[PDB]
Structure 1
């Protein structure tokens, strides 16, 4: 029985070779493979396939391969690839990508993806399913920011803070075992995966290491607390012994040494460079050279992503997070000039497009936007596609390679950096069921659904007092996955191995799932996905002219962007 591709794409979603435009951007993603069998597609509804005695098996119990949730006809976009498949979720963990259904009456059904009485069906046809975004740079300032992340498909927040405190407003640091314990207790009410970073400063090992023993998932070295080489040495030693990641916010003033001194202090050890470009913070002006080292994992905050006409003017007055500046003082005005360099931002755009910068982050409420990581990532992708044109590996007029490269910048690379890749980061079997469903016209702007631990945690849903869920006002809303004790089962609180072994979750009475931070000091730049490029970056100390392999790096700012006024009221 013939079916034209249009009707098939309308009914079950685009198949092999069918391309989908991402939001209002100019990026087309083409399906590479399909795991379903034609004519045996699984769908739910009255008179549809998934029924007892039909594509749903009514014989086996829960323990006999029957899933707990099946996402049907999903369009998986992941660093692994872009392909159509059905997702099986059991016990809150992804237990299969393939063809789910009834093995008795269907062909090619994945053996562990039997649809049974315990299965709950979610129709993902016509939607793009992505892994929950990981945010490694989060200033915990406002409890309302969590929803701001959830509305943009972010499921993990890594960082420190105790609220609207000056140290928290400036640095992602939860200083001290007591504050770490208090924030860990507070995280029981946040419907999001949380990782807490401690203060990686001090001349002695013990003050830093007691924070890790208290439950810290990592360390942050900020120039506000003093980014001396002694602090870097002690923090890196503690991280190596405890197997946790260290984030560095280098010394902008170059007070205790230039970038070379910081590199010597690091001594080839694995470190995570926050806002490696420099505008957010770092060694003025040659901090971006850190992006060229194999032992450095570079990230970049969103406000400079991408290069726009208003980026230069906006960023000048937002510098007040670090310390306040007066427009008539000769020194602090000079501080502003050497901090925001348009050449560095223009080069950072291309570095992101060239796979040199590996990750993306918000660095929220501290010269960063909480709910624009994915939005600005795809805006940068579209702008670089328009300017630089298609990449070398692209083919068939599709942007599959660019999509894979840019999706890794906020899904798997942060997870690998923090060592939480074994649990979250990508849509793979055995990983936590953190999924985001986007409508293709709202992809990267508003998340249609956010499922955490196999239960829908956030939804763009309409009036709660109507006959059906669709009528206006359609807005983001917390779902049943964030209500009551369920909020303890759908979220993970990543902590250090030593804290977990010492019984910190039991001592503090934490009810959330506990994730182990591991495999952090054995990784490097080559461990990044689609962004494992190491080179030499020359930053001119005089004109800030950024050069790579002898060629200049610059781009023209764009006045208009996709994922813009077309979507947002303000």
Structure 2
């Protein structure tokens, strides 16, 4: 039997060689591989394949996956392939060919009576996003982020308090405890950051032992060389990550002094470009060092017509020293080259919590338009650029904070945090958001309707976000010390617990597709950014995709 590739694409989604446009951008992905056996694809429906004795086997629950995402077009740092996805015990079981071994060939993902089915033919499946720059200003941010496709949130705060408005810090044991408890009510995996600004190591150890998976050094609390050193010392001791927002005022020294204080120790620099904070006007030079894991906040991504104008007030003498067109324009290119490895929000403190994914793709769109194909690109597609950019908000953030053994990518053994997208709405509005094996939130039509599709259709929380179900499907990250001291039992945390590790050994070279260490310099007077003497710059966009075509406001 034969079938035209078009009819095939309509029935089971695209296959090897077929290209798909990501939303309304100019980025095109091409299916690199297909793990199916033509003619043996699994489809669910009346008279279709997944039925007793046919595509569904006679095996017991222990011998079959709990969930199968059929004919999914995976987009991950390791590849863009067409395959079936098996989920078991809340984790990624396998990526391959689903079906019944009794009558079907090459079945690697067994479907049985205990198997639920999610039809993904014609859909793009990605790992949940991970935002490592969250200001816990309000609990509502969690749902906003979940809706956008971000399944893990790392940050600090106690609520709408002055300290939190400005920094990602959950100050001391009492607040840390309270926030760990409140975390059980939120539908995303969470990790907290404590206040790392202190020159007494015991004050820091207490916080780590209390539960935080990292320490935030912020200039508002005093980002001095003494404070920085003290935080890194405790970090090397307790295997936790340090996030830095350097001395913008150059009060205690310049950028090189801070770099000296850090002493080659691992550190994650927040908003490395500078607008969101850091030594004026050259904190961006930090991305040249091997021990630096650099990320960007999202208001500056990408450089557009209104960027500069809006930034002055979101900030409001050091304003015009902080907001620079030169470094802002360069930042986009540095992302395209792999010099900047992560993207984050900086939620409600110069950042948009639900625009991390959206903005990263807009930067990719703009760079393709301005610079063309990347040197690593093969074939007539943007596969490598896509892999480079998706890594910025998935695997890299996960490596940076020592949680990549649990989440960050679609790999066997990791927690099943997946986002299903329709090509037309990729990176803007997802079709399904799965937390730990359960749909946590998805667009839903009229509740009293005969079908789930009638209007109005808006995102509503599902069973994966309800009480005990939620606890079983989310993770609360603790520091090894906190886990050992039995914090989870003492606070009576009800969610699953995961411990962070490998925060001190990760380096720039470990950043997937984003390990560039450029010989970058910044002119002290003109603020011009140069890599190997070449000027790095770009043009501001007048109109962007993934914008006015999708939003009501």
When normalised by structure 1's length, the TM-score is: 0.96
Please report how far the alpha carbon of residue 395 of structure 1 lies from its aligned counterpart in structure 2 after TM superposition.
2.7
Distance (whole Å) between structure 2 residues aligned to residue 250 and residue 29 of structure 1: 38
Matches within 5 A, 1:386-535: 386-535=369-518
Equivalent position of 2:145 in the other structure: 149
User: 2: CA distance between counterparts of 1:418 and 1:7?
Assistant: 45
After superposition, what is the alpha-carbon deviation per residue over 1:511-540, rounded to whole angstroms, capped at 9, x for unaligned? 101011001101100000000111221001
Give the SS at the match of 1:318.
helix
Aligned to 2:11: 11
- Runs (4+) of structure 1 exceeding 6 A deviation are none
Alpha-carbon distance in 2 for matches of 1:448, 1:216: 33
Distance 1:17 1:464 in 2: 40
How far apart are 1:130 and its partner, in Å? 0.4
Equivalent residue of 2:164, what SS? helix
- Could you tell me which residue of structure 2 aligns to residue 327 of structure 1? none
Q: Please name the residue that 1:32 is paired with.
A: 32
- SS of equivalent residue, structure 2 residue 29: strand
Within 2, Cα distance between the matches of 1:462 and 1:528? 40
Asked if residue 54 in structure 1 is aligned to residue 54 in structure 2, the reply is yes
2:239 aligns with: 243
Unaligned ranges ≥5, structure 2: none
Q: Secondary structure at the match of 1:167?
A: helix
Contact 2:419 2:434 in 1 (8 A): yes
Contact 2:294 2:341 in 1 (8 A): yes
Which residue of structure 2 aligns with residue 42 of structure 1?
A: 42
Distance in 1 (CA, whole Å) between partners of 2:65 and 2:541 is 48
- Partner of 1:88 in structure 2? 86
Cα distance in 1 for partners of 2:543, 2:378 equals 27
Q: Work out the CA distance in 2 between the residues paired with 1:547 and 1:76.
A: 37
In structure 1, what is the equivalent of residue 523 of structure 2? Answer: 540
Once residues 390 and 424 of structure 2 are traced to their aligned partners in structure 1, the CA distance between those partners, rounded to angstroms, is 17
Q: Which residue of 1 aligns with 2:347?
A: 364
SS of the counterpart of 1:221?
A: strand
Q: Tell me, what secondary structure is at the counterpart of 2:460?
A: strand
Matches of 1:49 and 1:423, distance apart in 2: 33
Query: Can you give the 5+ residue segments of structure 1 that lack an aligned partner in the other structure?
Result: 321-333
- 1:325 match: none
Give the paired residue count.
Answer: 553
- Contact 2:185-2:467 at 8 Å conserved across structures: no
Deviation at 1:88, TM superposition (A): 0.5
Does residue 1:76 correspond to 2:74, yes or no?
yes
- State how far apart, in whole Å, the 2-side matches of 1:181 and 1:299 are: 28
The 5 Å alignment of 1:218-233 reads 218-233=214-229
Aligned to 2:322: 339
Deviation at 1:142, TM superposition (A): 1.5
TM normalised by structure 2 equals 0.99
Aligned pair 1:289/2:285, yes or no?
A: yes
Q: Distance in 2 between matches of 1:161 and 1:374?
A: 22
CA–CA distance in structure 2, aligned partners of residues 218 and 435 of structure 1: 25
Q: Does the alignment pair 1:215 with 2:211?
A: yes
Contact 2:417 2:437 in 1 (8 A): yes
Aligned-pair CA distance for 1:396: 2.4
Which is further off, 389-398 or 400-409?
A: 389-398
CA-CA distance at 1:304 after TM superposition? 0.3
Q: CA deviation at 1:462?
A: 1.1
